[PDB]
Amino acid sequence: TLTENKRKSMEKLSVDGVISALAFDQRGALKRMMAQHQTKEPTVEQIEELKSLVSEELTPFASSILLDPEYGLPASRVRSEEAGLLLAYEKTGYDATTTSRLPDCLDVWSAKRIKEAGAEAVKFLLYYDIDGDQDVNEQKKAYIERIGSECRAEDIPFYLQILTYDEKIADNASPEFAKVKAHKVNEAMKVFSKERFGVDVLKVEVPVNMKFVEGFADGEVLFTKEEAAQAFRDQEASTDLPYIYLSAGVSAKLFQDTLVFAAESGAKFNGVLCGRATWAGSVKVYIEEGPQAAREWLRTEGFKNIDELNKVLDKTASPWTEKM
Amino acid sequence: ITLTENKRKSMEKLSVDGVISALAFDQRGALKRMMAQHQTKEPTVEQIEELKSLVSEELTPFASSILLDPEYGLPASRVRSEEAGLLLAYEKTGYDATTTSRLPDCLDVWSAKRIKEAGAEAVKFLLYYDIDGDQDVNEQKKAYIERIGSECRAEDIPFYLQILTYDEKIADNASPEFAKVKAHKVNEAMKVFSKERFGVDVLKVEVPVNMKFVEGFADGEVLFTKEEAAQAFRDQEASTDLPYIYLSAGVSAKLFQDTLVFAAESGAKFNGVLCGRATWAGSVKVYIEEGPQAAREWLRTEGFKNIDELNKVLDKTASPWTEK
Ligand SMILES: [Ca+2]
Ligand SMILES: [Ca+2]
Ligand SMILES: [Ca+2]
Ligand SMILES: [Ca+2]
Ligand SMILES: [Ca+2]
Numbered sequence: 001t002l003t004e005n006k007r008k009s010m011e012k013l014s015v016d017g018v019i020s021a022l023a024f025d026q027r028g029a030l031k032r033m034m035a036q037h038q039t040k041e042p043t044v045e046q047i048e049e050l051k052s053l054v055s056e057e058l059t060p061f062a063s064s065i066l067l068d069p070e071y072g073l074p075a076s077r078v079r080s081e082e083a084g085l086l087l088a089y090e091k092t093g094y095d096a097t098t099t100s101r102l103p104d105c106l107d108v109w110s111a112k113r114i115k116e117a118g119a120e121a122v123k124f125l126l127y128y129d130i131d132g133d134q135d136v137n138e139q140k141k142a143y144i145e146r147i148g149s150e151c152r153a154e155d156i157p158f159y160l161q162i163l164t165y166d167e168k169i170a171d172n173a174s175p176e177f178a179k180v181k182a183h184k185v186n187e188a189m190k191v192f193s194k195e196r197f198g199v200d201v202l203k204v205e206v207p208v209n210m211k212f213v214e215g216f217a218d219g220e221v222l223f224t225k226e227e228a229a230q231a232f233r234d235q236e237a238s239t240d241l242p243y244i245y246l247s248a249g250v251s252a253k254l255f256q257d258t259l260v261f262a263a264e265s266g267a268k269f270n271g272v273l274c275g276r277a278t279w280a281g282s283v284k285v286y287i288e289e290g291p292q293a294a295r296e297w298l299r300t301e302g303f304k305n306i307d308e309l310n311k312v313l314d315k316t317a318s319p320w321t322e323k324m
Numbered sequence: 325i326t327l328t329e330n331k332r333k334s335m336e337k338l339s340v341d342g343v344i345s346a347l348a349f350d351q352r353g354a355l356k357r358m359m360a361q362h363q364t365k366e367p368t369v370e371q372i373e374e375l376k377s378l379v380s381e382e383l384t385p386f387a388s389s390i391l392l393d394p395e396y397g398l399p400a401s402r403v404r405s406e407e408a409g410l411l412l413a414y415e416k417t418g419y420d421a422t423t424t425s426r427l428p429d430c431l432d433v434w435s436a437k438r439i440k441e442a443g444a445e446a447v448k449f450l451l452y453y454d455i456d457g458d459q460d461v462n463e464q465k466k467a468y469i470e471r472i473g474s475e476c477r478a479e480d481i482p483f484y485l486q487i488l489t490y491d492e493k494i495a496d497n498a499s500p501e502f503a504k505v506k507a508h509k510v511n512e513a514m515k516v517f518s519k520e521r522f523g524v525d526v527l528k529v530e531v532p533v534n535m536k537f538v539e540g541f542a543d544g545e546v547l548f549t550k551e552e553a554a555q556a557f558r559d560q561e562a563s564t565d566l567p568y569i570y571l572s573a574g575v576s577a578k579l580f581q582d583t584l585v586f587a588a589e590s591g592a593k594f595n596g597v598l599c600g601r602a603t604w605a606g607s608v609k610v611y612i613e614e615g616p617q618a619a620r621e622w623l624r625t626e627g628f629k630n631i632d633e634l635n636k637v638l639d640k641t642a643s644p645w646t647e648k
Contacts (some may be wrong), residue, residue, distance in 0.1 A: 108463045110470040112521060138433045145435040146475055153478035153523075196437060198478075 001324055005155045006200065009120040010320070013064040013084035013157070017319020019201070019244050019271025020310060022278060024054055024075070025068035025088040025123070030283075037287040044071065050286050050294065051075035054279045057298035059083035061306045066123055066273065069109055073117060086159060087119040089147070094127055099167035100136045101127035103143050111150035121157040122147070123203070130187040132167050141191070148198020161203035161246065161273075162188050173249070178209040178222055182231040186238040193239040201320070202243040203273050207231040210250065210258050229265035236267045242320035244271040252277035252305065256312045263316035270320040272313065278305045325566065325648045330480040331525065334445040335645070337409035338389040338482070342644025344526070344569050344596030345386075345635055347603065349379050349400070350393035350413035350448070355608070362612035369396065375611050375619065376400035379604050382623040384408040386631045391448055391598060394434055398442060411484060412444040414472065419452060424492040425461045426452035428468050436475035447476050448528070450486040455512040456505075457492045466516070473523020482525040486571065486598075487513050489530060503534040503547055507556040511563040518564040526645070527568040528598050532556040535575075535583050554590035561592045567645035569596040577602040577630050584641045593643035603630045 002010065013019055024030075030050075034042040048071050055075040059065050064084035067076050076085050089109060094101040103126050114122050124147055128140060144160065151158035164184035169177045177184075185207040192199055208231045212222035245262070247255040255277060262269055281301055286294040327335065338344055351358075355375075359367040373396050380400040384390050389409035392401050401410050414434060419426040428451050439447050449472055451465060469485065476483035489509035494502045510532045517524055533556045537547040548556075570587070572580045580602055587594060606626055611619035 105471070108460075108467045110467045111474055112470050113467065135433075142433045142435045142438065145437050146430070146471065149436055149478040150471055150474040151478075153474040153476075 002200070003155055006157050009084070009157050010200070012120045013086065014271070014320065015063040017270070017321035018063065018313060018317045019242075019273075019320070020063045020306075020313055021086065021244070021271065021273045022054070022058055022062040022065045022306070023246075023273045023275030024051055024279065025066050025072060026275065027068055027070055027092050029092075033280075033283050034287055037284050046287070047071045048074050049291060050283070052078050053286065053291065053294050053298060054282060054302075055079045057295060058279065058302055058306055061303060061310065063271070064120070066275075069106060069114070069117065076118060084120040085118055086121040086123045087114045087117060089114060089122050089124045090126075099129075100133065101129075101165065102136070103127070103140060105147075111147065111154045111156060115154045115156045119156065121159045121200075122151050122154075123159045123161060125161040125163065126192075127163050127165055128184075128188045128191075129165050129167055130184055130191070141197075144192065144197050144199075148196070151200075152198050157200040158198055159201045159203055160192055160197070160199045162192065162205075163248075164188055164205060173209070173211075175212060175220060175222055178212045181205070181209055182207040182234060186231070186235050189235065189238040189243070193241050199241060201270075202239060202241055203246055204235075204243055205248075206245055206258055206262065207235040210254060210261070216254065216257065216261075225261075228261070232262050232265035232267040240323060242270045242323050244273055245269055247272060247274040247277050250277075252309070256309065259312050259316040268318040268322075269316075270323070271317050272309070274306075274309060278302065278309065325525075325645075327525075328480055331482050334409070334482050335525065337445045338411065339409075339596070339645065340388045342595065342646035343388070343638060343642045344567075344598075344645070345388045345638055346411065346569070346596065346598045347379070347383055347387040347390045347408075347631070348571075348598045348600030349376055349604065350391050350397065351600065352393050352395055352417050354417070358605075358608045359612050362609050367612075371612075372396045373399050374616060375608065377403050378611065378616060378619050378623060379607065379627075380404045382620055383604065383627055383631055386628065386635060388596075389445070391600075394431060394439070394442065401443065409445040410443055411446040411448045412439045412442060414439060414447050414449045415451075424454075425458065426454075426490065427461070428452070428465060430472070436472070436479045436481060440479050440481045444481070446482040446484045446525075447472070447479075448484045448486060450488065451517075452488050452490055453509075453513045453517075454490050454492055455509055455516070466522075469517065469522050469524075473521075476525075477523050483523055484526045484528055485517055485522070485524045486528040487517065487530075489513060498534070500537060500545060500547060503537045506530070506534055507532040507559060511556075511560050514560065514563040514568070518566050524566060526595075527564060527566055528571055529560075529568055530573060531570055531583055531587065532560040535579060535586070541579070541582070550586075553586070557587050557590035557592040561594075565648060567595045567648055569598055570594055572597065572599040572602045575602060577634060581634060581637045584637050588641040593647075594641075595645040595648075596642055597634070597638065599631075599634060603627065603634065 052075040059080040066086040213228040377400040384405040391411040
């Protein structure tokens with residue numbers, strides 16, 4: 001199930017078997033945010049500095065941090081010594097002119113190099129449509145096998161992130177996609193839980209768009225609480241691997257309500273990958289007010305944000321040590 | 325070296341008394357172009373698959389193993405002599421002639437795990453490498469080979485790395501201009517890819533000299549004395565402690581055989597060969613023009629004569645990899 005070194009790495013990424021990972025491997029996305037508050041093009045120096053500030057100030061309150069090798073290596077070196085490190089292995093984005101969204105590793109990186117850079121885990125993002133072109137998915141499955149094999153050889157945990165989509169639906173925030181999301185998410189988890197892919201932890205979406213669930217919905221309601229709850233139980237039944245939720249797309253408050261709903265429904269999720277919901281406010285402050293201002297924001301609102309999340313995690317998350 | 329139990333067993337299957345006498349037939353596009361010279365119609369998948377099966381069935385009784393391609397070669401792999409091991413090619417063929425980078429790329433729906441599952445005892449990968457070339461291109465190449473070596477470590481299957489050298493600024497590798505730098509290209513690349521981080525088990529390489537320019541073998545211009553050519557072989561032997569075998573490329577069976585004798589007398593302790601075209605080339609024309617049974621007869625006579633002479637020469641020239 002786990003080797004000695006994989007186990008020690010998992011322990012370093014976790015606290016009492018729960019993963020509270022701070023996500024900051026954003027690259028193009030972060031540049032765009034920064035680009036909001038200044039005229040000049042955001043610089044390499046600024047991106048590297050902001051990542052270092054967030055890492056330095058908030059990793060004492062996180063079990064681990066996810067960074068990118070492109071801008072995040074300086075930040076990784078100033079993380080809390082008690083915090084583990086995950087490094088992203090994939091190139092960002094996808095070709096919007098096609099529907100295949102094929103995976104591609106960073107050109108001058110390898111699992112070995114990620115380990116050599118001091119990571120306790122390899123993170124890789126895969127876009128997957130279970131109902132998509134079968135040859136496309138065969139290529140995707142082959143690619144993940146390679147990465148899973150690399151990680152076994154280098155004896156470093158493999159964190160596979162799955163973002164689902166539909167080749168025929170442009171907007172994943174649409175009601176049309178919400179109706180099939182549980183299917184997309186849970187069936188993908190079933191595929192990638194197979195031993196052949198070498199995954200140690202799955203980083204996945206919640207199997208429902210909570211914005212369409214009764215009580216959580218501001219607008220149209222597509223699902224009852226009981227229907228949403230069943231999707232979470234179906235997800236829990238879709239894998240025996242540790243899995244953690246990504247907070248991408250929703251507010252901090254909604255994500256936290258979702259963790260509660262997940263736990264109450266019977267999901268035994270083992271933590272979260274949360275980023276933007278925690279450090280977003282530091283970006284404008286850093287750009288408009290500079291480095292020191294960001295530190296004080298991070299020591300105050302930043303701590304409050306991640307502290308609130310941790311308190312929610314305490315009463316909702318299950319330790320991965322109960323899956324081993 | 326060090327080997328795991330399975331890697332050793334696989335190596336044993338590919339070898340006889342520590343010597344690799346491998347038949348190479350992973351040609352794809354190259355083989356198609358050969359066939360097209362003898363008929364009007366485009367060569368069919370059926371034809372390519374059939375000729376590979378004929379060569380495998382008829383000649384693998386006289387080889388320690390056979391190298392085949394996944395694309396057309398799987399049926400052929402299943403009719404090889406039970407005493408012969410199997411290598412499968414992992415790389416896409418060819419390179420972009422409009423650029424000088426010649427970047428490597430694995431077959432889209434394959435992985436080291438899938439190659440193993442297809443019954444192979446080795447993963448073979450061809451890398452084009454110019455040691456003096458663009459440093460960033462070579463960084464990308466080194467990262468890529470690290471990934472493959474790691475795969476093979478995890479799947480516990482020997483990694484056979486084929487290196488073909490070139491120069492970004494020299495169009496023809498058969499030129500006297502390239503002959504003057506070949507030893508450098510070949511021997512320095514071997515030093516690089518003998519590093520532990522690349523996970524190579526056997527290197528498949530060019531002889532470090534173009535013998536057609538060596539005194540006594542040369543019809544035209546003479547660039548090297550025999551002592552100079554001999555020194556290039558000693559320099560090559562001094563470039564690696566890994567098992568390595570010579571590819572014939574590039575040359576006639578007789579010249580190749582004379583080259584093996586010269587290599588051994590010079591002090592090269594090479595551990596076998598990967599020989600293909602020099603052995604089975606004549607069967608292509610026969611197969612297309614006269615059909616399968618005629619090709620079998622060609623293979624049983626001239627084909628056998630080619631590989632039999634080679635085997636006798638190997639027997640007195642090659643050194644066992646088991647002394648490493
Ligand atoms: Ca721990
Ligand atoms: Ca709430
Ligand atoms: Ca023709
Ligand atoms: Ca040596
Ligand atoms: Ca001998």
